[PDB]
A paper describes a structure:
CARD9 functions in myeloid cells during innate immune responses to activate NF-κB and p38 MAPK. Upon activation, both CARD9 and CARD11 recruit the same downstream binding partner, B-cell lymphoma/leukemia 10 (Bcl10), which interacts through its own CARD with the CARD of CARD9 or CARD11, a CARD–CARD interaction critical for subsequent signal propagation and NF-κB activation. The CARDs of CARD9 or CARD11 are thought to form a nucleating helical template that promotes polymerization of Bcl10 via the Bcl10 CARD, which, along with other domains of activated CARD9/11, then recruits downstream factors, including MALT1, cIAPs, TRAF6, and the LUBAC complex that mediate subsequent ubiquitination of multiple members of the complex, including both linear and K63-linked poly-ubiquitination of Bcl1013–16.
We found that CARD92−152/I107E spontaneously formed filaments after a short incubation at elevated temperatures, which are readily visible by negative-stain electron microscopy (NS-EM). With the CARD92−152/I107E construct, however, we found that the filaments now remained predominantly singular when frozen shortly after inducing filament formation. With this sample, we were able to generate a 4.0-Å reconstruction of the CARD9 CARD filament. The coiled-coil domain is disordered relative to the CARD core, such that the reconstruction contains only CARD residues 8–95. The CARD adopts the canonical helical architecture of a death domain, with helical symmetry of a 5.11 Å rise and 101.6° left-handed rotation, consistent with a growing body of literature demonstrating a narrow range of parameters adopted by helical assemblies of CARDs (4.85–5.13 Å rise and 100.2°−101.6° left-handed rotation) including that of Bcl1036,38–41. As detailed in Fig. 6c, interactions within the interfaces are predominantly electrostatic in nature, consistent with our previous observation that increasing salt concentration can inhibit assembly. As monitored by A350 and NS-EM, mutation of residues in the Type I (E15R, R35E, D66R), Type II (R29D), or Type III (D43R, K58D) interfaces completely blocked filament formation when tested up to a 1 mM concentration. The exception is the flexible α3-α4 loop, which adopts a ‘closed’’ conformation in the NMR structure, but an “open” conformation in the filament, stabilized by interactions across the Type III interface.
Author numbering:
A (entry chain J), B (entry chain I), C (entry chain H), D (entry chain B), E (entry chain E), F (entry chain G), ...: 8 to 95
The structure:
């Protein structure tokens, strides 16, 4: 691992800003997630504030390592450039 | 029994393809299920992926024998013909 | 007590017909229940058929006596008149 | 007694098919069980497979005689007719 | 006897694999055990590893002869076929 | 310790007001909790009133000392200022 | 003592009505119980009917005297006023 | 005495039917038993079948006379009416 | 055996990554598990962190040998290829 | 030995803080414990406070020497760093 245990250093910022409906497909084509986990992220009558969703998604990525990390990171510097800069 | 213990031979295919919101009423009129089990299949804040639902429904039918089997089978060859062919 | 041990004589009818989302507030203002018990009745990922809910609510009222009985009864003859008639 | 010691002749079938959440209230109004035993049947973090539950319930009825037997039997021929036929 | 004193030749395999919560009812209907011994097998705050339980059950059957032996054996070839094959 | 054994002096107020879904991430980045304990706090089909949850969370923090105390305290004076004032 | 040996005069009423999940925290801040005894009251896979729980809690308070008595009593006249009146 | 030496005439029926967790508190308030004997009845890792428990309890009552007899009897005609009728 | 006693060499990785709701059906059709064990894995109000679940499932497979091992292994190289590579 | 007889110098701190459900698997792969002892640690209807559990586990490790000591120690400095520092 060695990467998530540090990126997590700041998580409130992400959980507040980022949104899933854009990140999901690019990841999907970089072959990380499966359909089921996506539908669990999005359609669920229990978690609604939009923040629990990001929490679940970010944890599902943490369960995977370097690969999913790179996918997430590249997606991020492609969509949210100033946030990527803040990360680095 | 003698029937479910073989039809189960292939279950992934069904659990992936089939969906409940169509099968439920035809069965309902062939007098197998009750309202309560139907609402349990559908409205439940715990199981969401759409696959656990099919699992529960298929098990509720397994709990009953030849009768429910014939109902399910006829419904299936009425809606999903190529899948019925695959079964046979 | 002397009242619930007889009203219980017929319970299937109630558990089938009545629904909580209407009875709850009127009781709430007749000062019987507390918020916590209400949320336990309604939001719980274990009991879903709508009938276990009525069971729990009716038992929570049985735990209290004449007071809650009168509250429930008056609510009932205010909302469900023909069912009240059946009770009497 | 003279009745349970024979009905027990076939118990696997029942323990597999029957379910409690329907039988419980009708019995409850035929005045056999008490609340405590019901909650013990249902809410218990030790026994989960759904079969131990039916075992406990059926034994609690065996502890009582002709009365509970008739209650159980009538409930059964009211809900599960083909299973009643199998019994007779 | 003449049967248990040989079947015991291999006991570790059974005590490791088999589990009671399935065998118990079929035996129960073949009229070997009584309720009390069953509850002693299962609910006891002293023996917990799951292996002492099988030990006690298997000994309770040894206390009885040909009859209980046949019951156990038939149950076994009905549930655990490859284990029955290993026995024979 | 020397701190929790006094802050506990008033606990009803907290257990009534505070809610977890906001406190959890800030703590998470101050590196106190782990994912598992978080999921135990939130997703559990036994404890539902919202108060047992706060109880468990507050105890999990008590199990840790000065560090978790400071984290909790700073989070609190960042989100709930008047409640922090009441604490001091 | 001189107090519990009389309050016990009526115990069925309490053991039926009262519930722990509300009384526990107020007592906890009046510094009577410890965490361990609380978790023993609540989470235990042996005692389930809700009544054994109240029994254990009430005995744990009896083990302590005037102090715990006053705590329990004040909690009670704060939550259950008509029951307090019945006590007096 | 003159009473127990006759009521004992039929003991199997009681030892089979009755259960302690209900009788114990009413007796407790009629001031017959002490806490210690109650805990001995219930929590003991040696006697488990539920029948030895009733045996011990019934003997502890026999050790006392007319008083405990009346307590037991009244409790019984309050909970188990048909069994009381069988006694008389 | 000779296989599990080595595959266990690394267990933290699996217990962290793998999840049951996907593995369960494929195994189910390779005829290893029974319904009861599946429901025990999934629906149980005691074990919640998602890790105890994998522990129980993996042990239930260990109780069986070469057969269940091959089933698990093939499922794994069908769903989680990089994890299979890590295994080999 | 020469190691446990000193580490025991402070035991209250450990028995209060540490928890088993995390330590168990890492040890399990360092090949110290067996399944049976693990299930005895966790699932037992007698010991519940969470502290007796740690006591039993720590003693089971003491029964083994240098090997289990090193396993426990490394696990600890991998999960609980500040507690490891306190140890050293």
């Amino acid at each position: 691992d060695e990467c998530w245990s540090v990126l997590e250093g700041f998580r409130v910022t992400l959980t507040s800003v980022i949104d899933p409906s854009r990140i999901t497909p690019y990841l999907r084509q970089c072959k990380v997630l499966n359909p089921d986990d996506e539908e669990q992220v999005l359609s669920d009558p229990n978690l609604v504030i939009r923040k629990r969703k990001v929490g679940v998604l970010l944890d599902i990525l943490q369960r995977t390592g370097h690969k999913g990390y790179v996918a997430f990171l590249e997606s991020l510097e492609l969509y949210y450039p100033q946030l990527y800069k803040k990360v680095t």
